[PDB]
């Protein structure tokens, strides 16, 4: 099967999570996702299908987590963007105020703005530290959403909110609820992974 972000996938088929973005450490292949998803040895299923498992992952602290793929995977540099894909070309910053899309599960593809970032949140699984706000939509099931720019830069894997039974915590005006999602960096810098580019 093909590796992109924003590919939907299930753990132990529990856990409702998206693909983040295409890495490589040496010569084992995986994809970055948040840590809520699951454990050590957890099964990711992409696409309804197993594909590998949880190498590593972070919690509570953080929200970030390393699959590891069998060698039967291809790692794309593409993040879902509806019919079309965006081509990963680095995992740059994008700047507060800067438009930025990412690609879940239920909601699949929304777009939006930053308004912070740096932000630690406490959840009721723990804190989760290194998080950026923005105004795009959030919805449950789509942790791990794939943050790119436009640009083709990185940003980050989503962790999550308070989010509502009605699906979403985007029906809520900005100044009440919004999105937050771990910077992509921290992570690759956390277990040596290498981003998958084209």
Same mark, same amino acid.
């Given at each position: ?22 890495v490589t450490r040496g010569?084992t292949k995986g994809f ?36 590891? @793929? %069998? ?6 540099? *593409?993040?879902?963007? /509806?019919? +079309?894909?965006? !081509?990963?070309? $680095? ?33 009721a699984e723990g804190a989760?530290?290194? @998080? %950026? ?6 919805? *449950?099931?789509?942790? /791990?959403? +794939?943050?790119? !720019?436009?640009? $083709? ?39 040596? @992974? ?5």
């Amino acid at each position: 099967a093909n590796i992109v972000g924003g590919i939907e996938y299930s753990i132990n088929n529990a856990s409702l999570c998206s693909v983040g973005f295409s890495v490589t450490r040496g010569a084992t292949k995986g994809f970055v996702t948040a840590g809520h998803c699951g454990t050590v040895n957890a099964t990711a299923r992409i696409g309804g299908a197993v594909v590998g498992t949880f190498a590593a992952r972070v919690f509570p602290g953080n929200d970030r987590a390393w699959v590891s @793929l %069998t060698s039967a995977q291809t790692l794309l540099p *593409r993040v879902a963007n /509806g019919s +079309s894909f965006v !081509t990963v070309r $680095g995992s740059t910053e994008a700047a507060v105020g800067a438009a930025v899309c990412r690609s879940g599960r239920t909601t699949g593809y929304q777009c939006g703005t930053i308004t912070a970032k740096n932000v630690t949140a406490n959840y009721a699984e723990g804190a989760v530290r290194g @998080l %950026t706000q923005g105004n795009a939509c959030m919805g *449950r099931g789509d942790s /791990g959403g +794939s943050w790119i !720019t436009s640009a $083709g830069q990185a940003q980050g894997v989503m962790s999550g909110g308070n989010v509502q039974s009605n699906g979403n915590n985007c029906g809520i005006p900005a100044s009440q609820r919004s999105s937050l999602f771990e910077r992509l960096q921290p992570i690759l810098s956390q277990y040596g @992974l290498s981003l998958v580019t084209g």
